[PDB]
Every structure is written in structure tokens, then in C-alpha cells.
Amino acid sequence: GQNNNSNFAWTAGTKYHLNGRNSLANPGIAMATHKDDEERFFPSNGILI
Amino acid sequence: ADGVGSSSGNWHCDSTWLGDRVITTSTRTWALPTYNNHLYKQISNGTSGGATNDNTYFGYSTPWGYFDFNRFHCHFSPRDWQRLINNNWGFRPKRLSFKLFNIQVKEVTQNEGTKTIANNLTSTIQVFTDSEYQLPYVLGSAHQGCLPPFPADVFMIPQYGYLTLNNGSQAVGRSSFYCLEYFPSQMLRTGNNFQFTYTFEDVPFHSSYAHSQSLDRLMNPLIDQYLYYLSRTQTTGGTANTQTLGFSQGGPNTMANQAKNWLPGPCYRQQRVSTTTGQNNNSNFAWTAGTKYHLNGRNSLANPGIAMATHKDDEERFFPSNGILIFGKQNAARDNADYSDVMLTSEEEIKTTNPVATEEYGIVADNLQQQNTAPQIGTVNSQGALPGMVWQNRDVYLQGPIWAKIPHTDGNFHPSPLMGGFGLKHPPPQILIKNTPVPADPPTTFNQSKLNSFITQYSTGQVSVEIEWELQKENSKRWNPEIQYTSNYYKSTSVDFAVNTEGVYSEPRPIGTRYLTRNL
Amino acid sequence: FGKQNAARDNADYSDVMLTSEEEIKTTNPVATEEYGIVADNLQQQNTAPQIGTVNSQGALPGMVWQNRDVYLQGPIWAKIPHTDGNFHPSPLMGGFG
Amino acid sequence: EYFPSQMLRTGNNFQFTYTFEDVPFHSSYAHSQSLDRLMNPLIDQYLYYLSRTQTTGGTANTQTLGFSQGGPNTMANQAKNWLPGPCYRQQRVSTTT
Amino acid sequence: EYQLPYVLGSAHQGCLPPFPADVFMIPQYGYLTLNNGSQAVGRSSFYCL
Amino acid sequence: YNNHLYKQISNGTSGGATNDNTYFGYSTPWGYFDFNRFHCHFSPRDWQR
Amino acid sequence: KENSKRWNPEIQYTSNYYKSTSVDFAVNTEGVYSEPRPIGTRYLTRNL
Amino acid sequence: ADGVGSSSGNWHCDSTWLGDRVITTSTRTWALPT
């Protein structure tokens, strides 16, 4: 219920461009998943699942 | 025993291949003029003229001159360059030898309208190497005046000069002045010769290959991943679509979604230009739209810049505005030369791991999505090093520079010269040469001021340079045939890489070193 | 740095001494200016080229730089944190890492 | 108090020695050259740069490509091997309030 | 001698099972090379095992 | 696998695929071993130790 | 071994640079290996 | 062996510092009239 009502997984994804071809940056560089008391949040393509 | 009647050296031009090493040797004939009438001179440029602040300088021009062998065609014939690039994965320099011999000093006197030239057998020349790197190093800026590619040409030795710190056209207190006469040098009459040897430091092999894989295609195309990615934020196929979370495994039909271990190299973005002029914008944007860096209030074009792929697939006609090396054809004009008169290099082979120069690096998030507010993205035009990046350097050409001196600094990142080459802490030392001044007749009464009258004079001789190169052999299980550099089969008015009817040697096009391929 | 007997809080400009890193201008960009200019779009006959200003720039292949200077009043060393990775571990207040 | 320590009365002393690890020399010098001025001011380059996108001196100016060699009067246009160090931009303050 | 495209390292299914009593199927080997669309270019390599 | 054959395999935009997903390559008759996950080598108890 | 003082570059056998539906000297989608064209051995040159 | 074609000396201009001593060397070019 807290997310935006849209299908943004690909359009809002974090990506890199190579030779005219877009690749999702997954999981990407190592970054902290969330801050204090924000366990319910995660990066869109930033973690292992 | 050396004498006027005995030659002090022989002509050596050869290439020798011995399994893992190749040794090149070149000999040329040079002529050295007297520069600046034996004087050091302060030279500077400031805004008081029409010059802008970006172009100001302060420095000195010396009476001396220097040797430059720092282009590859100094050491390789076009055929020898073909043997190298078609069969080896990599190569690097090892050691070198230098010789200076068969010196002739000549004097020219001019009376009325007639001119005569004679030998001066007792004159000398002065030569020294700066092997402690105590002078400003001007080698490495891609200046004219190297040894000619064609062995029968006779070349003029360029004049040495240097720059120091400036403010406008003025000098500051840290500005240094150097006298080349303050170094110990060897003096040679017509029967003397000069030589020294040098060893290169350990340096990585130049990569002379193109990748047969791209960085985003390293997976097995048959098998699924066991990792999941977020594939759905919203319900589909219903009267009212709602929020949900959906996950999928990455697989053959979605490669753009799979998890990967590596990232493309860094990006500093260039403006795109077409060789079809009708497609360009109707404006003079070369300087205003140029890609530049700022240093001490002074703008410098970033040229060629970091190594980036020149264009993407089926876009050969586009090139970065100041992002590539450009060579001139024989007899091409100095200023405002036409497109036909120049040769453009291409870095298309590094597309596999390096981003295209005229495109963005990628996309990142700008805000925090909420039920009330939709997500927003932003474009990354310049990207610094990130953990997990891999990249290739720029290629080397037969017409291009071999090495550069790494600046002496607290820190550097990946010190490969951006015009391409081998970065060296202790490069081959620069070699300085000058005609010794010979005064004319002084007055018969003493005068304290320095003599300003001299005998007009110049010198000639031969110079040899020999370099040993280490080779990295190609070891490959590829089944199908490779791409190789070849000459054209069809008939033509002249032969490429030869003289014409006039006797002018020309180089048809630039030749890189990337033909053989390797897996990523 | 503070002058002798300078206040702890809200000291005047006269009461303090300011260091200068003007000597590294030769290889290091000025702190209050941009790094450079890059392209923003793709020029066409219909659309003019656009540029953008680079305010923060990460390491690029081919960069050279100097560290910050040390002072007679300043720190000598710092301990490098124990981590998986670091980039050019010279202490930013100046010194020996 | 969970570490072993030496206890000293008024007649006791304490000492130890330490060796520094290999570390680069602090650079105590300023450069006499700037990174964008490493070229020989007398000689032209053999490389070319794009100097003209448009025809000049005519009734109607049109698209064209022009190339020039870099030289003494255009140093800002020459090809170079090196780049300035990294940037993280600061706001500017004057000592004249 | 690392003369083949290395497909290990992409987190594919088909490793040895975590539980020692399970019997597993061996995965099929394959590889990718350079492409333009669905076509191949001249640098594309073919390998025979 | 593949009835003992090597086969050319590719994906292009001629179908419904987008440009980001195109590829060209080969599927071999061979197969390979993969031990590259940690639970191949460690029991949950040994991972705890 | 070839030992030659020729200055200009020789003619060499090479694969085509341009894109194509298949790779030369490889299998096709069916799995049939084919040989595109005959290849001789005369590329390097010698004086008469 | 000295001859017309062989130089009899080299150019030496240097300063060397060795703890408690310094050694200077200079070379100049001169002209002598009658």
C-alpha cells in the first residue's frame, strides 16, 4: 500500500548502457540496504533474492 | 683510430624476428641548423593581443635541438607492422640502443648574390642525454619532427623549448629558468661518435586484440539463474489494477534482467558529429559544445580523453567531437583542412567493455517513490570509477606515439597515456644536440660585452636507434578464421605505402593493432 | 588554526589562521569551481547541442593529483580503517596513512 | 582493566620501541609546470582537431567539417595525455564580508 | 588454459545439490558471442569442444 | 544433448523481443560440472561453526 | 619460413568484417557444418 | 691520438655537494684577437 500504483520495475530500474543496449544493474555495487528502523524497504534491483 | 678520412659508423636498418622477440633498427640522415642565433629567449603569450585566457603561456626557447623517435613508424615498416598485428596478442618494449655518427660540420658564407658552402674540420657539436630527468620533458606531446617513416628521407632536427608557470603573459616567483649549458655534454669533431643504451622498466603488454564477447553476455544461454529479480509492481488483467510484488528468475529470454558480476568502464561524455554534414546542426559548435576540463581558471579541451567506443552498431558515420585521434594525409593543410584530407581513427573494438563516447553511462534514481508520488530517474553523463568496472585502453597506431612520461605526483589512477601508449616513470631520456658557436673576428681593442658576431654554420650526420620488443604469442582454440589486416587485391594507379611518380612517400590510412580476438 | 587565547566558539576572523593549498593548482582543480563540461544531448540539424556542468567527479583513467600539505601545527599520521577496500588511503586532514 | 599493564612506583620507568611501515615520502615541493602546459611551445602537433563546423564569410553559412593541427597559438586545443584530479565542489566565501 | 568462454560465474542452476542424498542432472553447456540483432559479425567465434 | 549436435541459436527483434535481449551463440552436445555454491561444500551446521 | 624485404603490406586470407546470418566455417541452426568457399595457399609473394 | 678530426675535451659544467665540500665546474667559449 505504500508503493506507487504503477508497474515501474523496468522503467524505474537502475541500469547501465552498453553498445546501444540497456542492462539492469543487478545487484550492483555494495550499498546498505536500508537505514535504521526501515527494514521494510529494499533497493529495486539492488539485492540478492 | 678515428680520423677525418675514416667513417665512424655503418648504416643499420633491419628487423629480426626470433620466436618471442623482435628487434628493429633504423638509420636516418639529419641536418641541424643554428637556432636563435645561439641565444636563449623569453617567449610569452597574453590577453593583451587577441588571445584568450585559455591560450596564455610563459616560457623559453633554447638554442638547442633534440631527437625524437617516439612514433611507431620510426621503427616498423608497414610489412613488419603487419607481421606484428596479425599474429600476436600483445607486445612491449624492452631495451634500446642509440648511435650518432659520421658528423659533418659545414660553414656557409654569402657574398653579394652568390653562396658557397665548405667544410669546417675543427668545429664541434655538443650532445648529452638527460638521464636524471632534470629538464622539462617535452617528449610525449605528439610534436612534429620525429624520424621520418621512410628511410631515404632527410629530416630537420626540431628546436627545443619549454614552458613554466604563468599568470597571463607574466611569470610568477615559482617560474624556473633552465640553461642547457649547465649540464656536462660530450663534444664531437668530424671523427667522433656517440652512443648509449637504455632499459625499459616492466610495463604491461599492449593489448592487441578485440574481445569476442560482450560484458553483458557472459552467461550460459541455455540455463536459468537461481536468483530472482523484481518483475512486477502492479496487478495486470483486471478491472482495477493494484499494488503487488512479483518475482522471476532470469533466463534466456530475459538477459537484460539477469544478475551480473561486472560493470562497464568509466564515462565522460562527448558530443556527436556526423561525416554527412547535412545531418549536423547548422552552427559553429566545435569549441562551444566541446568537452572540456577546467584548471586554474583556464579551459582546456579534453582531447582525445578517456577511452570510449567511437560509435555503436551501424553508426560508422558518427564520431565524438574531440574524442578521437586524427591524422593528416600527405600535403594536407595546417589549418582548416577538408574531411577528405584527414584520416579518422576508430575505437569500435572496445564496445564490448567500454561505453560509447556519445551516449550516457546509465540511469539512476532521483527521488523516493510513494503512493502519492511516482518514481523519477536521471541520466548519468559522467561516471567515475566504481568497484567492479573493467575497461580497455585506447589502441596504438603505426603513425602514433609509443610512450609518455608519467607525471611525478602523489597519486595517479591507471597511468596509461590517453593518446595511447606505454606510461613510464623513467622514460627513454631526451637527447639534446647543438652546434658549438664559432665567433667571427673580434676587435683588436678589448671590449667587455659578449660577442654577437659569428660564422654561419650547420651540421649533418646519421643516427641509429635499435629497440628490442617482447612478444606475447596468440594461443587460441577458435575454429573459424580470424580477421586480418590485408592489402587490397584490385588494381590501382599506385601502390599503397610506396612512393608516387614525384617520389613522395605517403601513408594511405591509419593502421591499428586489433585483429585477433580473445574471450572476455 | 587558532591564535593564542582565541575563543572556543564564534571566534573572529582576526583570531584565526587560514591555510592555503594554492600550490597544487597545477594538477588539482580549484575547490570552488566546476571540474569541466560534458555533453547532454545528441545534436541534429533540427536541435542545437547542449552541455552540462560537472560539479563532482570520480576517478578517471589518466588523472594525476597531489595530496594536501602538512603543517608544523598539523597532524602527522592517521590509522587506515580496516576494510575490504579503500582508494588512495592518504588522510584527508593530511599526513601519513 | 582487561589488558595486561605494567605498574610503576616512584622508582620505576617504562619504555618501548616501534618501527614504521614503508610509506611514500611526503611531497614537500610545488610544481613549476602546470598539467595543461607540458608541450614544446615552438613546434606543431601532427594530430588534428575539429576546428570548424560551419562555413564563414558568405551570404548564407552552411554545414562543413574543418580540421587543424594544434600549435603554439592554440594550446587549449591540443591533444594531451593526462587529466586533472578529482573534484567535489565547495561553496566560496570571501574574507571581505 | 582458459581457452573456452567461461560460463561459470553467472549464478546458473545445476550445481551439486545442498543435500547429499539427492541425485542431480548435469546441465548443458552453451555460450554466446558477439551479435548485431540476431545476426553474427565477423569477429564472432565458433568453438568445437 | 542436442542429439550429438552443435547448433546455432539466436534471438532477435523479428519476434516480440526487444533490442536489450538479443543474442547470438551456440549450444553444444557437452555438459559441465558446477560446484560454485557454498552449500555444495558446507552443511548448515558447518556453516554455523 | 618467409624471409622478405618487401616494404608494403602483403595480401592475406581474412574473414569478412560485415554482419551475416551465420558464421563461415561453423554449424547452422540445424547443426550442419559447411565450408563457404575453397581456400588456396598462395598469399605471400616472392621475386622471380 | 690527437688529430684535426678529434676533439680534445668535453664540456663540463656542474656543481656537486658532498656533505662538507662542494665542487664547482665551469666551461666557457673564448675568442683571442691579436
mmCIF file with all atom_site columns, C-alpha atoms in Angstrom, chain F:
data_model
loop_
_atom_site.group_PDB
_atom_site.id
_atom_site.type_symbol
_atom_site.label_atom_id
_atom_site.label_alt_id
_atom_site.label_comp_id
_atom_site.label_asym_id
_atom_site.label_entity_id
_atom_site.label_seq_id
_atom_site.pdbx_PDB_ins_code
_atom_site.Cartn_x
_atom_site.Cartn_y
_atom_site.Cartn_z
_atom_site.occupancy
_atom_site.B_iso_or_equiv
_atom_site.pdbx_formal_charge
_atom_site.auth_seq_id
_atom_site.auth_comp_id
_atom_site.auth_asym_id
_atom_site.auth_atom_id
_atom_site.pdbx_PDB_model_num
ATOM 1  C CA . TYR F 1 1  ? 22.097 -33.336 -25.511 1.00 0.00 ? 1  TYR F CA 1
ATOM 2  C CA . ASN F 1 2  ? 21.112 -31.990 -28.946 1.00 0.00 ? 2  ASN F CA 1
ATOM 3  C CA . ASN F 1 3  ? 21.265 -35.485 -30.473 1.00 0.00 ? 3  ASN F CA 1
ATOM 4  C CA . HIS F 1 4  ? 25.068 -35.163 -30.513 1.00 0.00 ? 4  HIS F CA 1
ATOM 5  C CA . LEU F 1 5  ? 24.936 -31.889 -32.471 1.00 0.00 ? 5  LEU F CA 1
ATOM 6  C CA . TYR F 1 6  ? 26.247 -28.356 -32.232 1.00 0.00 ? 6  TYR F CA 1
ATOM 7  C CA . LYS F 1 7  ? 23.573 -25.787 -33.045 1.00 0.00 ? 7  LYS F CA 1
ATOM 8  C CA . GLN F 1 8  ? 23.442 -22.094 -33.833 1.00 0.00 ? 8  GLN F CA 1
ATOM 9  C CA . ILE F 1 9  ? 20.991 -20.341 -31.511 1.00 0.00 ? 9  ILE F CA 1
ATOM 10 C CA . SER F 1 10 ? 19.896 -16.700 -31.611 1.00 0.00 ? 10 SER F CA 1
ATOM 11 C CA . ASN F 1 11 ? 17.283 -14.165 -30.533 1.00 0.00 ? 11 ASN F CA 1
ATOM 12 C CA . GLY F 1 12 ? 16.312 -11.000 -32.434 1.00 0.00 ? 12 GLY F CA 1
ATOM 13 C CA . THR F 1 13 ? 13.752 -8.203  -32.692 1.00 0.00 ? 13 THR F CA 1
ATOM 14 C CA . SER F 1 14 ? 11.948 -10.010 -35.537 1.00 0.00 ? 14 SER F CA 1
ATOM 15 C CA . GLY F 1 15 ? 9.907  -11.649 -32.789 1.00 0.00 ? 15 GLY F CA 1
ATOM 16 C CA . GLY F 1 16 ? 8.440  -9.797  -29.861 1.00 0.00 ? 16 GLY F CA 1
ATOM 17 C CA . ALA F 1 17 ? 11.883 -9.459  -28.303 1.00 0.00 ? 17 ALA F CA 1
ATOM 18 C CA . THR F 1 18 ? 13.310 -6.028  -27.620 1.00 0.00 ? 18 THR F CA 1
ATOM 19 C CA . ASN F 1 19 ? 16.768 -4.807  -28.543 1.00 0.00 ? 19 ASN F CA 1
ATOM 20 C CA . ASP F 1 20 ? 18.000 -5.271  -24.983 1.00 0.00 ? 20 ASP F CA 1
ATOM 21 C CA . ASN F 1 21 ? 17.501 -9.052  -25.105 1.00 0.00 ? 21 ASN F CA 1
ATOM 22 C CA . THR F 1 22 ? 19.104 -10.010 -28.463 1.00 0.00 ? 22 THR F CA 1
ATOM 23 C CA . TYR F 1 23 ? 21.865 -12.625 -28.662 1.00 0.00 ? 23 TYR F CA 1
ATOM 24 C CA . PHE F 1 24 ? 23.813 -14.974 -30.926 1.00 0.00 ? 24 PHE F CA 1
ATOM 25 C CA . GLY F 1 25 ? 25.599 -18.149 -29.918 1.00 0.00 ? 25 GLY F CA 1
ATOM 26 C CA . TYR F 1 26 ? 25.858 -21.922 -29.906 1.00 0.00 ? 26 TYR F CA 1
ATOM 27 C CA . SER F 1 27 ? 24.561 -24.877 -27.886 1.00 0.00 ? 27 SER F CA 1
ATOM 28 C CA . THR F 1 28 ? 26.951 -27.824 -27.616 1.00 0.00 ? 28 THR F CA 1
ATOM 29 C CA . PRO F 1 29 ? 26.279 -31.530 -27.082 1.00 0.00 ? 29 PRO F CA 1
ATOM 30 C CA . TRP F 1 30 ? 28.512 -31.394 -23.971 1.00 0.00 ? 30 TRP F CA 1
ATOM 31 C CA . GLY F 1 31 ? 27.778 -30.847 -20.299 1.00 0.00 ? 31 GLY F CA 1
ATOM 32 C CA . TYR F 1 32 ? 29.648 -29.484 -17.323 1.00 0.00 ? 32 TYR F CA 1
ATOM 33 C CA . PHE F 1 33 ? 30.054 -29.755 -13.556 1.00 0.00 ? 33 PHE F CA 1
ATOM 34 C CA . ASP F 1 34 ? 29.395 -26.791 -11.267 1.00 0.00 ? 34 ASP F CA 1
ATOM 35 C CA . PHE F 1 35 ? 30.298 -26.805 -7.561  1.00 0.00 ? 35 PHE F CA 1
ATOM 36 C CA . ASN F 1 36 ? 30.354 -22.974 -7.241  1.00 0.00 ? 36 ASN F CA 1
ATOM 37 C CA . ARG F 1 37 ? 27.755 -22.543 -4.460  1.00 0.00 ? 37 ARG F CA 1
ATOM 38 C CA . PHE F 1 38 ? 28.720 -22.662 -0.773  1.00 0.00 ? 38 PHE F CA 1
ATOM 39 C CA . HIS F 1 39 ? 26.102 -25.188 0.272   1.00 0.00 ? 39 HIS F CA 1
ATOM 40 C CA . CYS F 1 40 ? 27.824 -27.634 -2.062  1.00 0.00 ? 40 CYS F CA 1
ATOM 41 C CA . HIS F 1 41 ? 30.664 -27.740 0.438   1.00 0.00 ? 41 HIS F CA 1
ATOM 42 C CA . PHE F 1 42 ? 29.135 -26.872 3.841   1.00 0.00 ? 42 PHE F CA 1
ATOM 43 C CA . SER F 1 43 ? 26.356 -28.336 5.915   1.00 0.00 ? 43 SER F CA 1
ATOM 44 C CA . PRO F 1 44 ? 24.215 -25.787 7.754   1.00 0.00 ? 44 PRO F CA 1
ATOM 45 C CA . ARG F 1 45 ? 25.935 -26.804 10.986  1.00 0.00 ? 45 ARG F CA 1
ATOM 46 C CA . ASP F 1 46 ? 29.410 -26.413 9.475   1.00 0.00 ? 46 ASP F CA 1
ATOM 47 C CA . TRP F 1 47 ? 28.395 -23.010 8.156   1.00 0.00 ? 47 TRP F CA 1
ATOM 48 C CA . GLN F 1 48 ? 27.436 -22.118 11.725  1.00 0.00 ? 48 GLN F CA 1
ATOM 49 C CA . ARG F 1 49 ? 30.838 -23.170 13.068  1.00 0.00 ? 49 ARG F CA 1
#
